[PDB]
Amino acid sequence: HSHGLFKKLGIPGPTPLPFLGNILSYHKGFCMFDMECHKKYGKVWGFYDGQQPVLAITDPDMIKTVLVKECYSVFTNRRPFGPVGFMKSAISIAEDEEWKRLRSLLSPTFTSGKLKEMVPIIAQYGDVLVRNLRREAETGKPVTLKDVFGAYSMDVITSTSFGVNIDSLNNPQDPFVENTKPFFLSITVFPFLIPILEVLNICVFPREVTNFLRKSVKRMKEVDFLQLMIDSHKALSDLELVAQSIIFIFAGYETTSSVLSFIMYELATHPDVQQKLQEEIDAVLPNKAPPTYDTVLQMEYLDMVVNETLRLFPIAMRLERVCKKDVEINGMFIPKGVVVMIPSYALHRDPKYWTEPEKFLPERFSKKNKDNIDPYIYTPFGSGPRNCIGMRFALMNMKLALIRVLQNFSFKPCKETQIPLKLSLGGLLQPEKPVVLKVESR
Amino acid sequence: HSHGLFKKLGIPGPTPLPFLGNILSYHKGFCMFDMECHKKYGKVWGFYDGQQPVLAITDPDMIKTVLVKECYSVFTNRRPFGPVGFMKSAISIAEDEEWKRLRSLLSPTFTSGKLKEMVPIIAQYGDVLVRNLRREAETGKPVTLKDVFGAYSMDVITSTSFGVNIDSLNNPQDPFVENTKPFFLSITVFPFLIPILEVLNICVFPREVTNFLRKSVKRMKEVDFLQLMIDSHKALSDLELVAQSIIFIFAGYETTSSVLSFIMYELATHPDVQQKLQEEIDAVLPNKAPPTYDTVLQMEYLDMVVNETLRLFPIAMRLERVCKKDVEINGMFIPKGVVVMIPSYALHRDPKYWTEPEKFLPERFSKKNKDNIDPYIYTPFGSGPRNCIGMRFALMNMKLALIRVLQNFSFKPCKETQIPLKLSLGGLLQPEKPVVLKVESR
Numbered sequence: 045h046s047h048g049l050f051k052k053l054g055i056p057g058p059t060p061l062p063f064l065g066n067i068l069s070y071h072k073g074f075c076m077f078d079m080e081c082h083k084k085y086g087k088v089w090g091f092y093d094g095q096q097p098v099l100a101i102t103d104p105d106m107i108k109t110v111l112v113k114e115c116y117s118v119f120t121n122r123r124p125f126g127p128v129g130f131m132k133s134a135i136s137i138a139e140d141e142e143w144k145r146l147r148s149l150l151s152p153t154f155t156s157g158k159l160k161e162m163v164p165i166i167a168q169y170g171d172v173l174v175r176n177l178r179r180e181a182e183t184g185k186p187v188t189l190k191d192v193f194g195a196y197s198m199d200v201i202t203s204t205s206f207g208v209n210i211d212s213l214n215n216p217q218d219p220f221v222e223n224t225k226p227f228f229l230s231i232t233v234f235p236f237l238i239p240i241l242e243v244l245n246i247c248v249f250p251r252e253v254t255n256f257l258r259k260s261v262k263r264m265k266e267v268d269f270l271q272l273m274i275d276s277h278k279a280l281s282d283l284e285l286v287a288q289s290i291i292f293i294f295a296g297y298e299t300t301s302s303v304l305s306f307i308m309y310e311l312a313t314h315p316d317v318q319q320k321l322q323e324e325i326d327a328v329l330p331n332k333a334p335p336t337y338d339t340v341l342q343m344e345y346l347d348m349v350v351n352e353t354l355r356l357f358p359i360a361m362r363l364e365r366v367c368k369k370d371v372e373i374n375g376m377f378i379p380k381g382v383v384v385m386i387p388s389y390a391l392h393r394d395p396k397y398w399t400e401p402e403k404f405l406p407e408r409f410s411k412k413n414k415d416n417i418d419p420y421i422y423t424p425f426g427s428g429p430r431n432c433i434g435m436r437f438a439l440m441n442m443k444l445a446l447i448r449v450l451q452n453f454s455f456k457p458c459k460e461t462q463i464p465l466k467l468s469l470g471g472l473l474q475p476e477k478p479v480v481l482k483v484e485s486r
Numbered sequence: 487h488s489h490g491l492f493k494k495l496g497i498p499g500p501t502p503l504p505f506l507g508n509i510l511s512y513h514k515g516f517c518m519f520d521m522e523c524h525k526k527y528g529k530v531w532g533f534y535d536g537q538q539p540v541l542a543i544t545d546p547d548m549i550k551t552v553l554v555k556e557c558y559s560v561f562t563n564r565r566p567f568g569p570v571g572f573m574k575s576a577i578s579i580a581e582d583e584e585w586k587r588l589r590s591l592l593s594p595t596f597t598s599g600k601l602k603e604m605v606p607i608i609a610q611y612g613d614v615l616v617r618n619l620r621r622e623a624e625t626g627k628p629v630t631l632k633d634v635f636g637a638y639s640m641d642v643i644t645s646t647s648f649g650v651n652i653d654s655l656n657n658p659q660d661p662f663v664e665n666t667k668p669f670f671l672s673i674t675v676f677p678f679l680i681p682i683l684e685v686l687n688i689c690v691f692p693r694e695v696t697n698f699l700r701k702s703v704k705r706m707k708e709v710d711f712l713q714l715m716i717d718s719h720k721a722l723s724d725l726e727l728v729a730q731s732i733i734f735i736f737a738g739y740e741t742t743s744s745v746l747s748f749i750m751y752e753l754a755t756h757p758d759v760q761q762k763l764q765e766e767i768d769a770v771l772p773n774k775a776p777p778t779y780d781t782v783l784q785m786e787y788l789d790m791v792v793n794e795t796l797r798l799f800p801i802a803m804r805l806e807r808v809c810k811k812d813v814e815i816n817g818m819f820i821p822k823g824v825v826v827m828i829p830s831y832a833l834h835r836d837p838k839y840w841t842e843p844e845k846f847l848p849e850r851f852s853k854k855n856k857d858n859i860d861p862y863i864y865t866p867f868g869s870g871p872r873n874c875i876g877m878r879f880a881l882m883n884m885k886l887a888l889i890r891v892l893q894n895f896s897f898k899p900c901k902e903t904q905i906p907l908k909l910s911l912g913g914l915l916q917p918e919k920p921v922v923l924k925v926e927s928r
């Protein structure tokens with residue numbers, strides 16, 4: 045019974061119920077729970093996800109020690125999440141030296157150099173998105189953004205991760221990679237059923253599939269994510285490689301469409317920001333000019349708009365590292381086995397570092413005010429050696445969509461637009477009611 | 487499904503059934519399974535304890551690399567065995583740096599210096615054993631050795647581990663440490679139920695107890711094992727210390743009585759060895775002289791008799807280390823997660839190193855022939871930094887019993903003496919039928 049651990053350490057927090065710990069406080073959601081705890085417990089508190097003790101920290105230096113200084117020595121891994129099956133070779137799930145090999149093998153694929161060779165490939169789908177937007181524009185009636193953006197996020201993945209060009213919004217039959225579409229609550233209070241479903245062949249990812257991917261990869265041994273990984277420690281195995289693109293499809297999909305929905309909701313409800321961004325868009329790219337890699341990395345107000353939306357909506361919500369051994373960081377003692385948690389959502393909306401945190405103010409990241417931001421309070425992609433490996437790709441993918449989207453259309457709220465936006469009560473950080481807006485052709 | 491691992495590595499072995507692996511081959515027992523496998527597969531083979539892949543090695547250099555060379559780097563831990571409860575602080579169960587601290591904290595207690603301060607304390611029970619033997623000697627009828635030796639092994643533990651002096655054979659009511667008295671088969675094919683019974687408070691050791699020990703240890707904060715540990719990295723905690731003596735009581739009990747039963751069975755069926763040992767006993771200790779520390783370490787034939795019995799009956803049977811990372815030792819590749827097993831029983835009875843291995847021949851360890859023995863074939867106490875930490879204590883404890891036992895009595899087989907001795911079909915290495923012999927007063 046480790047429920048007395050934090051009170052044995054003099055660490056405040058909510059009192060854990062036997063078995064459950066503090067998981068019943070998730071009736072408000074992961075984000076609201078961390079906000080309340082950050083408000084009433086101070087810089088550090090502890091809670092129990094079932095029997096698993098979790099230590100939350102909000103100190104920048106302590107976060108720097110966890111994410112960067114003592115990454116390879118102590119805080120190398122995240123905690124296990126469920127029956128992983130063969131997906132234990134995924135870079136986000138691999139641990140210790142086995143992860144170190146994967147990160148070193150996959151680092152070249154996400155260079156700024158490889159990113160520029162992909163800009164024309166995904167700008168092609170920045171055109172396809174407008175093609176499906178002009179449809180729901182002269183039709184003159186609101187649009188569910190997660191459909192067109194979800195189609196866009198699906199089109200870019202497939203062609204960048206496999207070279208398979210599709211119009212996912214206009215070819216819904218061909219299910220090339222439909223491989224994506226009350227468990228994890230139980231699996232947490234009951235982490236002992238994780239290895240049960242392992243031997244049971246029960247995978248959290250639909251396991252009867254993959255078989256289509258490895259056998260369709262048999263088509264690739266004999267510019268995209270696949271071809272960049274084949275060229276390559278020892279080389280990437282057949283299966284090991286397959287696991288990465290699956291983690292790439294999961295990572296590239298739900299993230300792109302949800303954030304793009306968050307950005308467009310902010311832009312529509314802040315037409316001044318939308319107009320100022322559209323002017324910078326029109327200025328840098330005169331006369332609906334095609335966006336390029338070097339142009340995207342010049343639109344300063346676009347970068348500020350993206351970074352501020354990710355501050356309000358860090359879709360990962362939390363950062364977690366497992367304490368591999370009894371250590372003593374920045375003045376306090378962390379026992380082995382404790383999950384160290386960094387509440388990115390709570391920190392991003394902390395008045396100790398942000399003025400009017402609920403306000404969408406892109407000028408926070410201006411070249412005047414950007415230098416005053418602590419790189420460990422603002423962690424939408426994490427930090428350290430185990431940060432978001434596809435950060436530059438994700439930002440470039442979303443910016444290339446927003447430019448072509450705003451080069452042609454302006455967006456306004458509707459009677460159906462959920463104002464204010466309510467965040468999802470589940471665990472992914474999406475809009476409760478999906479975002480619907482009016483799309484006017486310029 | 488890791489059952490294709492060894493055939494993917496070009497490693498011979500028995501074909502694993504789904505779920506079960508090769509555990510159905512344990513109908514013969516752990517020892518017979520390793521003997522057959524060592525006979526038909528060569529130096530190295532692989533099998534599956536359920537889904538857990540186990541690699542067996544019989545090469546001395548490879549054993550030296552596993553037990554000694556790459557102990558702290560790769561092969562630091564044994565594999566988990568079941569729901570451990572609070573017994574994860576036991577030195578035999580602790581892992582990595584947490585074990586490194588315990589071994590360094592408990593190393594002084596098992597010095598040859600601390601052992602001499604305990605010789606008079608346990609020689610007192612070498613007297614009590616004869617006291618209960620002279621009873622079943624003038625009564626003139628056979629004796630179940632595991633009762634008097636089990637009583638002896640219980641008396642020495644209590645007084646050395648707690649200073650509590652009892653005659654366990656004559657005070658059976660006072661259950662001071664009765665804390666000792668179709669699961670592990672299931673727990674192996676189903677290693678996923680290990681953490682189930684953890685949250686269920688189900689401990690493999692009777693958990694309602696301990697409470698008598700920690701609260702009776704409350705009696706010790708304010709020469710024995712307890713007092714030697716209190717004097718003491720950071721110090722040993724209250725609970726951490728309690729877990730050690732429990733592992734000490736388990737380790738000191740079933741081992742001492744079973745081996746003493748093995749020794750006396752060998753001595754009775756080899757009266758020449760018994761007579762030659764009794765002569766050396768009479769010569770070094772004239773006229774039933776009291777044994778001392780310095781005398782025990784002089785009886786060369788006693789040491790050879792003990793070492794040869796442990797060759798025929800290494801009660802631990804196997805040596806196991808977990809492969810913590812993908813490594814390449816002495817020419818072959820060991821993937822992370824594979825349990826590396828050293829069959830001590832199979833190696834001790836290998837004609838490649840032992841002539842007439844089934845024969846009890848104490849002269850194998852004579853100062854002429856002792857030097858020809860490989861320290862990694864003969865591993866009754868293991869080897870390397872994680873060998874049997876109570877080796878010198880166990881040997882001294884048994885030798886001190888045998889001397890006083892043979893200073894007064896000679897032992898002969900009976901009509902009930904199971905000749906030849908059949909080994910147990912369970913998993914502890916004990917006689918199938920308990921050893922019963924005639925005890926004659928000299």
Ligand code: HEM
Binds near residue numbers: 430
């Ligand atoms: C808006 C989009 C995205 C956001 C906000 C985001 C955010 C994050 C965060 C916060 C982490 C944890 C980092 C840490 O704990 O230090 C992470 C990990 C990761 N992300 Fe993303 N991500 C996004 C898109 C992507 C994309 C497009 C890819 C790949 C194509 C990707 C691949 C990964 C991987 C592989 C990891 C695990 C890295 C490791 O374990 O070494 N992510 N991401």
Ligand code: HEM
Binds near residue numbers: 577734796806870873
């Ligand atoms: C005839 C008596 C005994 C025999 C044959 C024996 C044999 C062994 C063997 C083979 C190992 C495994 C070593 C390895 O894997 O390298 C071991 C471990 C161990 N033994 Fe014994 N043992 C005996 C008695 C004892 C006694 C009397 C104690 C304590 C009072 C003890 C305490 C331990 C401990 C704590 C370990 C684990 C060490 C670690 O994990 O670091 N044993 N023993």
